[PDB]
Amino acid sequence: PQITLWKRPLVTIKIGGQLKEALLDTGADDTVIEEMSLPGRWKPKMIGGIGGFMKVRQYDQIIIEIAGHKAIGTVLVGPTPVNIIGRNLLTQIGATLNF
Amino acid sequence: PQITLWKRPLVTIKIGGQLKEALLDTGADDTVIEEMSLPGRWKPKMIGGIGGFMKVRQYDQIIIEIAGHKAIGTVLVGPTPVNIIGRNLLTQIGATLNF
Ligand SMILES: CC(C)(C)NC(=O)[C@@H]1C[C@@H]2CCCC[C@@H]2CN1C[C@@H](O)[C@H](Cc1ccccc1)NC(=O)[C@H](CC(N)=O)NC(=O)c1ccc2ccccc2n1
Ligand SMILES: [Cl-]
Ligand SMILES: [Cl-]
Ligand SMILES: [Cl-]
């Protein structure tokens, strides 16, 4: 699709069998999803943005569908206010910015 | 132009007579620039992101050139470590996300 930006670019994702809403975010390096159960071991990560830092759980090699497009990659889990699809997965779905 | 997302989508902007680097940020509602003076009136605002909230100054009707494309809108000024061009100005330059 071609997504304009008059509204937030929210899409459906599927992760852990579950549908969620998430924001397609070119400003985010990483993908951050609200607290949920994911399989396997996790590693620590500290992320930062506009109001400071957040500790998250880093899970690697997670299967995730984004607006119908399949990705397999790193998902950070933590108390984020919005599920964010960052560039690590935007690149897997072939997304670009155009003007 | 078409901008891929392997790296942060940074572009040159001109604001307040100054050249700066800024991030094209589809996940940001607002445009937020590091501390600088701008003409005219302003009012305080609190904006949210990962980590909580940041206090900023809100300046309206500010012209900005973004990668060569003129736009006008609200610009927030505060202690951001990265200048961000959010949707309020991305729309004005005709930016879309494509996949
Ligand atoms: C997600 C993470 C990997 C931590 N990356 C970032 O957060 C980087 C950090 C960079 C350095 C600091 C300055 C911002 C830039 C860009 N951000 C990405 C950037 O796209 C970021 C992602 C985001 C969206 C929604 C909620 C939280 C976080 N957006 C923002 O910080 C913008 C700022 C604004 N008010 O316009 N936030 C929002 O547009 C926004 C929208 C809805 C919300 C609901 C509840 C609480 C907060 C909400 N914030
Ligand atoms: Cl990844
Ligand atoms: Cl505006
Ligand atoms: Cl349009």
Residues of A with Cβ-Cβ distance to B50 under 8 angstroms = 32, 47-51, 54, 80-81, 84
Nearest alpha carbon to residue A85 among A67, A58, A60: A67
CATH at residue A61: 2.40.70.10
Q: Kindly give the residue spans of alpha helices, DSSP state H, lying in chain A.
A: 87-90
| Residues counted in chain A | 99
CA atoms of A38 and A57, how far apart (whole Å)? 10
| B contacts of A50 (beta carbons < 8 Å) | 32, 47-51, 53-54, 80
Minimal-distance CA residue of chain B relative to A29: B8
> Pick from B9, B29, B49: which is nearest to A97 by CB?
B9
A99 C-beta neighbours (distance < 10 Å), count: 17
Chain B residue with Cα closest to A66: B99
In terms of residue numbers, what domain contains B20? 1-99
Tell whether the torsion through CA atoms of B14, B93, A10 and A87 is positive or negative. Answer: negative
Three-state DSSP class for B49? Answer: strand
Instruction: Kindly list the strands in the beta sheet with A96-98, ordered across the sheet, starting from the edge strand earlier in the chain.
Output: A2-3, B96-98, A96-98, B2-3
Instruction: Please provide residue B67's backbone torsions phi and psi, each rounded to the nearest 5 degrees.
Output: 50, 40
What's the number of domains chain B is made of?
1
Measured between CB atoms, does B61 come within 8 Å of chain A?
A: no
For chain B, give the longest Cα–Cα distance.
40
Between CA A89 and CA A79 the distance in angstroms is 19
| B92: phi then psi, degrees, rounded to nearest 5 | -70, -25
Q: Name the residue with tokens 């909580």.
A: B52
**Distance from B62 to chain A by nearest Cα, in Å?**
19
Contact B28, B88 (CB under 8 A): no
Q: What is the resolution of this structure in A?
A: 1.0
Instruction: Report the alpha-carbon distance of residue B73 to residue B60 in Å, rounded.
Output: 6
Structure tokens at A44: 């620590």
